[PDB]
Amino acid sequence: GGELSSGDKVNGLEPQVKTKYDLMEKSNMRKSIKELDEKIKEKRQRIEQLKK
Amino acid sequence: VSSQRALQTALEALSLSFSDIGIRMVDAESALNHLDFMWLSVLNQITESQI
Amino acid sequence: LSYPDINFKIFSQGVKNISHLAQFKTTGVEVLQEKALRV
């Protein structure tokens, strides 16, 4: 990352990959997978109460 | 006013924006501090010559 | 005179942290992030 000697302020691919790795570490949202499975089981519990 | 929950939230974001603007006003205040002290030094040395 | 220690481990660590935390905060202030880009 930085300005090329040709004159281009590129960002460098390694911090971009590192940033998307930070996404796939945190913005991967495994906690949201947990909470959406919780949403599934709550809606499913409600509608099976509705079944009975 | 339960709609002003969200309107209050928009006011809170507006107050965030205003806090940003005030921070940059403090930055401009220090800018004008150093700047106007330079201008004073300029007029000082002019008067030093003129006396 | 004396030549005190200049720990480039800490230096390269800080450079890696700055480049690591450069494009982080996308919230709405963002002129702080502009200053971080300057840094």
Side-chain angles (χ1 to χ4, degrees):
Chain A
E3 185 176 1
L4 295 177
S5 65
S6 65
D8 193 2
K9 295 182 177 67
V10 301
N11 297 320
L13 291 178
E14 187 272 333
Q16 298 178 359
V17 171
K18 183 66 175 176
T19 305
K20 295 182 182 292
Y21 172 72
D22 296 331
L23 299 177
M24 290 186 183
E25 188 69 30
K26 180 64 181 294
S27 299
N28 55 4
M29 295 299 173
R30 176 64 178 271
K31 183 178 182 292
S32 298
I33 306 300
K34 298 287 186 180
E35 290 177 351
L36 263 296
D37 292 328
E38 185 177 1
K39 180 66 179 295
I40 288 177
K41 68 183 289 295
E42 285 168 352
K43 296 287 103 175
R44 178 68 70 191
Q45 181 181 2
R46 186 260 176 276
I47 65 179
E48 291 297 326
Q49 288 175 357
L50 187 61
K51 293 293 291 295
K52 181 63 70 178
Chain B
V1 73
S2 179
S3 175
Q4 281 177 355
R5 294 173 68 187
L7 192 153
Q8 182 70 43
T9 307
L11 291 172
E12 286 162 349
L14 183 63
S15 180
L16 174 62
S17 300
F18 287 167
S19 179
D20 296 332
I21 293 165
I23 288 166
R24 274 76 184 173
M25 284 180 180
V26 171
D27 302 334
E29 182 178 2
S30 177
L32 293 174
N33 191 1
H34 295 289
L35 185 64
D36 200 2
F37 184 74
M38 178 276 300
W39 287 108
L40 284 174
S41 67
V42 171
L43 293 173
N44 283 320
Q45 297 181 358
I46 293 167
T47 54
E48 292 172 358
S49 64
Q50 287 175 353
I51 292 168
Chain C
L1 294 175
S2 298
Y3 291 163
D5 191 3
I6 304 164
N7 197 359
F8 279 169
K9 184 175 180 180
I10 301 172
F11 173 73
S12 299
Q13 180 63 43
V15 171
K16 181 67 177 177
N17 291 317
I18 288 166
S19 300
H20 176 73
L21 296 173
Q23 295 178 357
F24 184 77
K25 182 180 76 173
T26 62
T27 54
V29 177
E30 306 299 322
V31 184
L32 297 178
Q33 199 186 16
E34 187 181 2
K35 290 183 179 180
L37 290 174
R38 296 182 180 94
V39 169

